Ligand binder design. Structure first.
Ligand SMILES: Cc1cc2nc3c(=O)[nH]c(=O)nc-3n(C[C@H](O)[C@H](O)[C@H](O)COP(=O)(O)OP(=O)(O)OC[C@H]3O[C@@H](n4cnc5c(N)ncnc54)[C@H](O)[C@@H]3O)c2cc1C
Ligand SMILES: Cc1cc2nc3c(=O)[nH]c(=O)nc-3n(C[C@H](O)[C@H](O)[C@H](O)COP(=O)(O)OP(=O)(O)OC[C@H]3O[C@@H](n4cnc5c(N)ncnc54)[C@H](O)[C@@H]3O)c2cc1C
Lengths: 287, 287
């Protein structure tokens, strides 16, 4: 019922800069993402290319960002947006068992280095999912595999382990996992998701595992899948100089809007996107 | 003789972010501008829209920028670039009695709120100039008028006063001037620069003053005049998503590249422009 002026999908520097600039402009904003902001921030050892803050690690830089947000009284909604559809003069954002409305949206979701697997596109919705928490009630007691591209997937696996019967976890990183002992860790490369009507198993380089469900856990999903109808230029959202996309009222910023992948470029684009959204909102009210 | 990899025209956040990113990438950079960085920084009372540094005045923000530059061992050349011409596979930058060469250039000069006067374009070079120091040797002992749009013009007027015979100073701001007593301050609006073959006087709303020279002192000049052959979109340089202009090896960033006029947008574009210049330089060496 309550409708936000701007919904911002992503909590890296693009989304945070967008949120601060929109709030400064008296708009009602909702900011989706992670309390950690971005795992790519957390990873960086020393950063000397963000003008005005130098010789800082990514963790120190994240803290400065967090302090700014709290000064501005901006809260991050720790929920993952699964899809966005236009409904005419607003957008409907769908999350696990929850929907929000916003007049405009800013996509600030970053990019994913890895490329999907064979069968992810075909099986999506047919045993394949990107949120294992939302789909954990389905296939309860069944056999589940989680392909974890981020450390947070481990947390989802530990919860899923209690509903499902037999859980496999495939880590896509070298850091040792912290999982309940009953979870079977498979240290192998996934190749393809098997099944015709529904997923029947997970094909790996060293073997095949029969499974009811395969959950794919990454820090983001492709914008063209998040927002059907959004025009892409290869791996990136097509944008103009004002960060406008082909969808009216939909703007983009940061890595998801193209190379170079850098923090202050992302913050600058987030500010452009926010000010374009402000202009759009104002024009919509007049007409 | 010595040729720089990148020449950056401007020392606001766009130019500074460009310089830091180019140096981080092992390029030989020259950075032109002001030790004060930008008068627009110095003016701002409180700034809460630059992600990571909050509740700061423009002077505090300028100091953080200066500290970063010194950490990176980057020096600002306090000279005003008057023109840039291509010479084939490099650019020639002309200053008062000095020239530099660079393989690529980044225009980061900001924008000027005021619009020129009648006769500025026609008389330019014929008694009209934008640097009163470079043109002070000419018309020595003659009658000079300076139209000052910035406080630094006062400093130029105090020097010019000693060569010229009779100097008028027209302030375009309300702050009281600090000038040698022999300088005649005219508190009136300039309308037009008079003359046919050469400037003959300065027409004001309340009267006309006969003069040999009219010097127009602003924080920047239009990019289309700085770099003849550069394509403009109205008041701004035409750029693409990679900050490329119509001139190969010439990039732009910040206010001069379009609205919104904001600090972190400018810093982000400066970073894009620097990384585009790095790519260009590398491609030029291979071919
Ligand atoms: C190791 C490393 C070091 C680096 N060092 C530097 C450096 O020194 N300097 C530099 O300039 N750049 C550096 N980078 C690159 C920099 O991290 C990125 O350019 C920058 O983080 C891009 O930020 P962003 O806001 O576009 O997206 P991200 O930082 O990726 O933030 C996106 C956030 O939004 C979340 N999100 C995505 N989709 C959704 C959804 N549907 N719902 C809810 N939340 C979602 C993501 O989980 C993520 O938390 C480095 C990158 C790496 C990997
Ligand atoms: C009063 C005020 C308050 C503001 N507050 C805010 C705010 O809170 N937040 C915000 O985001 N933005 C704010 N802005 C806008 C912000 O200042 C600009 O968007 C930003 O400074 C643009 O920076 P830039 O690097 O593009 O150019 P500038 O900041 O204009 O820097 C250009 C510099 O390069 C120099 N230069 C130009 N041409 C030449 C040449 N040929 N040779 C040598 N040097 C040259 C100029 O003299 C100048 O020093 C404010 C502006 C004003 C006027």
């Amino acid at each position: 019922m309550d409708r936000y002026d701007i919904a911002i999908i992503g909590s890296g520097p693009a989304g945070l800069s967008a949120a601060i600039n929109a709030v400064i402009r008296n708009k009602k904003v909702i900011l989706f993402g992670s309390d950690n902001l971005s795992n790519k921030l957390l990873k960086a050892p020393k950063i000397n290319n963000y003008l005005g803050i130098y010789d800082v690690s990514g963790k120190e830089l994240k803290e400065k960002f967090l302090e700014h947000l709290k000064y501005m009284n901006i809260e991050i909604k720790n929920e993952k947006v699964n899809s966005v559809y236009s409904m005419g003069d607003y957008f409907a954002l769908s999350l696990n068992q929850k929907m929000y409305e916003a007049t405009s949206i800013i996509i600030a979701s970053g990019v994913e280095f890895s490329k999907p697997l064979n069968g992810e596109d075909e099986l999506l919705g047919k045993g394949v999912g990107y949120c294992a928490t939302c789909d954990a009630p389905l296939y309860k007691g069944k056999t589940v595999a989680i392909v974890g591209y981020t450390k947070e997937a481990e947390e989802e696996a530990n919860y899923v382990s209690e509903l499902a019967g037999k859980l496999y976890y495939i880590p896509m990183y070298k850091d040792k996992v912290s999982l309940k002992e009953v979870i079977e860790v498979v240290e192998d490369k996934p190749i393809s998701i098997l099944g015709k009507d529904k997923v029947s198993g997970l094909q790996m380089s060293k073997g095949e595992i029969n499974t009811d469900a395969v959950f794919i856990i990454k820090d983001s999903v492709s914008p063209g899948k998040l927002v059907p109808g959004l025009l892409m230029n290869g791996e990136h959202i097509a944008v103009d100089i004002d960060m406008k996309t082909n969808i009216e009222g939909c703007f983009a910023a940061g890595d998801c809007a193209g190379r170079p992948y850098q923090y202050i470029k992302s913050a600058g684009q987030g500010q452009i996107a926010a000010l374009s959204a402000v202009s759009y909102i104002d024009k919509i009210k007049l007409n």
